[PDB]
């Protein structure tokens, strides 16, 4: 007798109706995968520093289609004649991004 | 089929367990969800150091001095606050000028 | 001062008082009741 | 098969009777469900406290920025009493001078301007500052409550006003 | 067939009880109408 | 013989578990809404967003204050937001991905509503 199966499906359908009408948000944020919260620093993890001639320079910025120079505390470009020496003394002989600095 | 009955009964058991032992109302469920996601958020914030950090700060275009600074990350506005010589300065992670000014200090820190 | 001895000179941890009251109190076994009821229903309908 | 249907109808009647028991203003159902509700609530107390103290520790981390004096005892006026508190060095929650083994000290005031009360709070700061009480989990473990969800209290009022 | 009609009777009675018990809650229009 | 068992189990689930659950949820949410209406006036500041709660047939619902460009107003002008009650109100029910971290703010708003009330 298919009537019993039909009526149990009606039972489960009214259960879902009751859940959806009232407990929509609870079941939505409980029984469902959800996207990770984005981090602005996650995008900047690849931001690293180098030297161009005598100017500190920034690389790794995704939205930075054209490379843009760095700025100091006074909103002015940083011009140092020993930029490469500074990088060798601080960051060593290998490039250093924000990831390893943050993980320190 | 037996499989349909089994899955229907298991759906019964799961929904009944949820309604009996889990917060049915939106407020307590939101509290639990915020507890979890704020655990992750606080891990993210505490990942940023808060103690003293030695770094070479460029006071002008061709002048640099080594000094100690403090850092604190705020995710309410997604910005960073830094302390230098008892003075607090804000840098937004979205504004181009703020990130451009902040990057040399963060990347030149030992 | 009539009920001065009713109060406590030392502070009272009323949360622990409530927690002992809950600990040493009748346990309505709804878990056992529900399992037994489901077993009874299954036996009465499916099994018999 | 007839017995199966009879049991079906009997259990349906039992379910309907239970629903009638639940919906109506039955004192027995009310007493039993209040029993269960009180037990569940007192169980949840701990998790609610932990959530609130994590949130308020985050807010205290945000608030303490460029103000070193916040980390030192200050005599704050609550209208009816003076409390000597600061922000905890480690957890960044409010922390006041304790009174014995109880809550924070409360120098009751008999008017709006009470120089003696404030001077006694200063005396507490300069002498009896070795024993302190911190809101959140420490106060929960010592006195059974976290200070939050309690009105009036210094933890919630100090956090809200600041 | 008999079980189906018996279940409809039980469901209708139980739905009547549930609605009568839930009128103050689900019918927000009723509660805001009468203050 | 098993399908009758399933029908009866689902009947019990609907009328002895879900319906009293709905009653309890409405009771608690209406009490929280009453305390909110008596304590807090119109919008409140949560995660630097302006949230206000209203009670409907499906319980309590949180709406965020957005301007003409569906951008949330910062709390810095909350006072005027109280005066302009006809501002654009965007509900938390719909997953509007244009506003970043909408679920963040809505869940935190509900959590603060529970904690205060």
Curated annotation (Swiss-Prot), chain A:
Disulfide bonds join 51-83. GO terms for cellular component: membrane; viral envelope; virion membrane. Most cysteines are linked by disulfide bonds. They are created by the viral disulfide bond formation pathway, a poxvirus-specific redox pathway that operates on the cytoplasmic side of the MV membranes. Unglycosylated because produced in viral factories instead of the classic ER -Golgi route. Keywords: Disulfide bond, Fusion of virus membrane with host cell membrane, Fusion of virus membrane with host membrane, Late protein, Membrane, Signal-anchor, Transmembrane, Transmembrane helix, Viral envelope protein, Viral penetration into host cytoplasm, Virion, Virus entry into host cell. Residues 28-104 are virion surface. It is a single-pass type III membrane protein. Its main location: virion. It comes from the Viruses. The chain crosses the membrane at residues 7-27. Induction: Expressed in the late phase of the viral replicative cycle. It is found in: Virion membrane. One of its GO terms (biological process) is symbiont entry into host cell. Belongs to the orthopoxvirus OPG099 family. Component of the entry fusion complex (EFC), which consists of 11 proteins. During cell infection, this complex mediates entry of the virion core into the host cytoplasm by a two-step mechanism consisting of lipid mixing of the viral and cellular membranes and subsequent pore formation. This is Entry-fusion complex protein OPG094. The lineage of its organism: Viruses, Varidnaviria, Bamfordvirae, Nucleocytoviricota, Pokkesviricetes. The gene is OPG099.
Curated annotation (Swiss-Prot), chain B:
Induction: Expressed in the late phase of the viral replicative cycle. GO terms for cellular component: membrane; viral envelope; virion membrane. Its main location: virion. It holds the Pfam family Chordopox_G3. It is a single-pass membrane protein. The keyword Transmembrane helix applies. Unglycosylated because produced in viral factories instead of the classic ER -Golgi route. Residues 21-110 are virion surface. Component of the entry fusion complex (EFC), which consists of 11 proteins. During cell infection, this complex mediates entry of the virion core into the host cytoplasm by a two-step mechanism consisting of lipid mixing of the viral and cellular membranes and subsequent pore formation. Interacts with OPG099/L5. Component of the entry fusion complex (EFC) composed of OPG053/F9, OPG076/O3, OPG086/G3, OPG094/G9, OPG095/L1, OPG099/L5, OPG107/H2, OPG143/A16, OPG104/J5, OPG147/A21 and OPG155/A28. Except for OPG095/L1 and OPG053/F9, each of the EFC proteins is required for assembly or stability of the complex. This is Entry-fusion complex protein OPG086. It comes from Vaccinia virus (strain Western Reserve) (VACV). The lineage of its organism: Viruses, Varidnaviria, Bamfordvirae, Nucleocytoviricota, Pokkesviricetes. The gene is OPG086.
Swiss-Prot record, chain C:
It is found in: Virion membrane. Component of the entry fusion complex (EFC), which consists of 11 proteins. During cell infection, this complex mediates entry of the virion core into the host cytoplasm by a two-step mechanism consisting of lipid mixing of the viral and cellular membranes and subsequent pore formation. It comes from the Viruses. Induction: Expressed in the late phase of the viral replicative cycle. Belongs to the orthopoxvirus OPG086 family. Unglycosylated because produced in viral factories instead of the classic ER -Golgi route. The chain crosses the membrane at residues 28-48. This is Entry-fusion complex protein OPG094. Interacts with OPG143/A16. Component of the entry fusion complex (EFC) composed of OPG053/F9, OPG076/O3, OPG086/G3, OPG094/G9, OPG095/L1, OPG099/L5, OPG107/H2, OPG143/A16, OPG104/J5, OPG147/A21 and OPG155/A28. Except for OPG095/L1 and OPG053/F9, each of the EFC proteins is required for assembly or stability of the complex. Signal peptide: none annotated. The gene is OPG094. It comes from Vaccinia virus (strain Western Reserve) (VACV).
UniProtKB/Swiss-Prot annotation, chain D:
It holds the Pfam family Pox_LP_H2. Residues 23-162 are virion surface. Its main location: virion. Disulfide bonds: none annotated. Contains two intramolecular disulfide bonds. They are created by the viral disulfide bond formation pathway, a poxvirus-specific pathway that operates on the cytoplasmic side of the MV membranes. InterPro entries: Pox_LP_H2. It comes from the Viruses. The chain crosses the membrane at residues 2-22. It is found in: Virion membrane; Host endoplasmic reticulum membrane. It is a single-pass type III membrane protein. One of its GO terms (cellular component) is viral envelope. Keywords: Disulfide bond, Fusion of virus membrane with host cell membrane, Fusion of virus membrane with host membrane, Host endoplasmic reticulum, Host membrane, Late protein, Membrane, Signal-anchor, Transmembrane, Transmembrane helix, Viral envelope protein, Viral penetration into host cytoplasm, Virion, Virus entry into host cell. One of its GO terms (biological process) is fusion of virus membrane with host plasma membrane. Belongs to the orthopoxvirus OPG107 family. Envelope protein part of the entry-fusion complex responsible for the virus membrane fusion with host cell membrane during virus entry. Also plays a role in cell-cell fusion (syncytium formation). Part of a stable entry-fusion complex (EFC) which is at least composed of proteins OPG143, OPG147, OPG155, OPG86, OPG94, OPG107, OPG104, and OPG099. Formation of the viral membrane is necessary for the assembly of the complex. This is Protein OPG107. It comes from Vaccinia virus (strain Western Reserve) (VACV).
């Amino acid at each position: 007798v298919y009537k019993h199966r039909l009526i149990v499906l009606f039972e489960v359908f009214v259960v879902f109706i009751l859940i959806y009408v009232f407990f929509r948000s609870e079941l939505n944020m409980f029984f469902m995968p959800k996207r990770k919260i984005p981090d602005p620093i996650d995008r900047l993890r690849r931001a690293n520093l180098a030297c161009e001639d005598d100017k500190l320079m920034i690389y790794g910025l995704p939205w930075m289609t054209t490379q843009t120079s760095a700025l100091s505390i006074n909103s002015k470009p940083i011009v140092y004649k020993d930029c490469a020496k500074l990088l060798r003394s601080i960051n060593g002989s290998q490039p250093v991004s924000l990831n390893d600095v943050l993980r320190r | 089929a037996s499989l349909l009955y089994l899955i229907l009964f298991l759906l019964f058991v799961c929904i009944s367990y949820y309604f009996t032992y889990y917060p049915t109302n939106k407020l307590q469920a939101a509290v639990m969800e915020t507890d979890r996601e704020n655990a992750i958020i606080r891990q993210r914030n505490d990942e940023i150091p808060t103690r003293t950090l030695d770094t070479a700060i460029f006071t002008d275009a061709s002048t640099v001095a080594s000094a100690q600074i403090h850092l604190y990350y705020n995710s309410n506005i997604g910005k960073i606050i830094m302390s230098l010589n008892g003075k607090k300065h804000t840098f937004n992670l979205y504004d181009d000028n703020d990130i451009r000014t902040l990057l040399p200090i963060l990347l030149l820190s030992k | 001062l009539s009920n001065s001895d009713r109060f406590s000179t030392v502070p009272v941890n009323r949360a622990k008082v409530v927690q002992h009251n809950i600990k040493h109190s009748f346990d309505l076994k709804l878990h056992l009741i529900s399992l037994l009821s489901l077993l009874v229903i299954w036996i009465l309908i499916v099994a018999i | 098969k007839t017995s199966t249907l009879i049991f079906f109808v009997i259990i349906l009647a039992i379910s309907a009777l239970l629903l009638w028991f639940q919906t109506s203003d039955n004192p027995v159902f009310n007493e039993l469900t209040r029993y269960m509700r009180i037990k569940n609530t007192v169980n949840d107390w701990k998790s609610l406290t932990d959530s609130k103290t994590k949130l308020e520790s985050d807010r205290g981390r945000l608030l303490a920025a460029g103000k070193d004096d916040i980390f030192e005892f200050k005599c704050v006026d609550f209208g009816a009493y003076f409390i000597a508190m600061r922000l905890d060095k480690k957890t960044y929650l409010p922390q006041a001078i304790r009174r014995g083994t109880g809550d924070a000290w409360m120098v009751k005031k008999a008017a709006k301007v009470d120089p003696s009360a404030q001077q006694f709070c200063q005396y507490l700061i300069k002498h009896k500052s070795n024993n302190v009480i911190t809101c959140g989990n420490e106060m929960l473990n010592e006195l059974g409550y976290s200070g939050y969800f309690m009105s009036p209290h210094w933890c919630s009022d100090f956090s809200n006003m600041e | 067939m008999l079980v189906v009609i018996m279940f409809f009777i039980a469901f209708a009675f139980c739905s009547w009880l549930s609605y009568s018990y839930l009128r103050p809650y689900i019918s927000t229009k009723e509660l805001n109408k009468s203050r | 013989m098993i399908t009758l068992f399933l029908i009866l189990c689902y009947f019990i689930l609907i009328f002895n578990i879900i319906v009293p659950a709905i009653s309890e949820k409405m009771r608690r949410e209406r009490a929280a809404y009453v305390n909110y209406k008596r304590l807090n006036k119109n919008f409140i500041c949560v995660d630097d967003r302006l949230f206000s709660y209203n009670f409907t047939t499906s319980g309590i619902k949180a709406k965020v204050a957005v301007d003409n460009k569906n951008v949330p107003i910062p709390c810095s002008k909350i006072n005027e937001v109280n005066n302009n009650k006809d501002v654009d109100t965007l509900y938390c029910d719909k997953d509007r991905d244009d506003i970043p971290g909408f679920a963040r703010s809505c869940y935190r708003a509900y959590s603060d509503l529970f904690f205060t009330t």
